[PDB]
Ligand binder design. Structure first.
Ligand SMILES: O=C(O)c1ccc(Cn2nnc(-c3ccnc(C(=O)NCc4cccc(F)c4)c3)n2)cc1
Ligand SMILES: [Ca+2]
Ligand SMILES: [Ca+2]
Ligand SMILES: [Ca+2]
Ligand SMILES: [Zn+2]
Ligand SMILES: [Zn+2]
Length: 163
């Protein structure tokens, strides 16, 4: 016989993702680079690797939508909820949805896609929100406007307790 695991995490180290569709705000290329950067944040601090699929069912299905888009987490227009993700598991587990009523950018303007993706992929991997306002996993977007991105220690300890 078998039993479910308590503590949601991936048991396999090589995960796949697929970008199902694209925001108008950025180039296909800029969106691909952003999500790849966001996965590299996590592969640099864990044994996980992330490979991209062009078709088929991937472990992490990435899409953009507005308002009601096919689950119980409807978006709400500009600002408010930026994105959400499902925790690790079969079916919809790992999927990351981005609100296409945001202005997505590769900069300090609007919402930085890489940054929000880094955060949501945290949920995809099994991290919940942090109480530390400096944390990547803090529930509220707060662009620090530093030159380069550094994963704060709070999120390193969290991810290391899982993987
Ligand atoms: O390569 C890039 O595009 C790039 C470079 C540098 C920085 C510098 N930086 N600005 N803000 C942060 C930073 C570092 C850690 N956490 C947050 C943050 O805002 N966390 C909460 C959050 C993030 C995303 C969505 C969300 F709901 C909550 C922001 N780092 C950001 C992005
Ligand atoms: Ca999935
Ligand atoms: Ca929104
Ligand atoms: Ca948009
Ligand atoms: Zn959704
Ligand atoms: Zn979150």
């Amino acid at each position: 016989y078998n039993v479910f695991p308590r503590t949601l995490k991936w048991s396999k180290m090589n995960l796949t993702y697929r970008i199902v569709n694209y925001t108008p705000d950025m180039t296909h290329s800029e969106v691909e680079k952003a999500f790849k950067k966001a996965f590299k944040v996590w592969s640099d601090v864990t044994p996980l690797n992330f490979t991209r699929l062009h078709d088929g069912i991937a472990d992490i299905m990435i899409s953009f939508g507005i308002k009601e888009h096919g689950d119980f987490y409807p978006f709400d227009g500009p600002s408010g909820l930026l994105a959400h993700a499902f925790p690790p598991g079969p079916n919809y587990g790992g999927d990351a949805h981005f609100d296409d009523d945001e202005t997505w950018t590769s900069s300090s303007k609007g919402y930085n896609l890489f940054l929000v993706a880094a955060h949501e992929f945290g949920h995809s991997l099994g991290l919940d929100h942090s109480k530390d306002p400096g944390a990547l996993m803090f529930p509220i977007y707060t662009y620090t406007g530093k030159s380069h991105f550094m994963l704060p220690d709070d999120d390193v300890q969290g991810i290391q307790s899982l993987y």
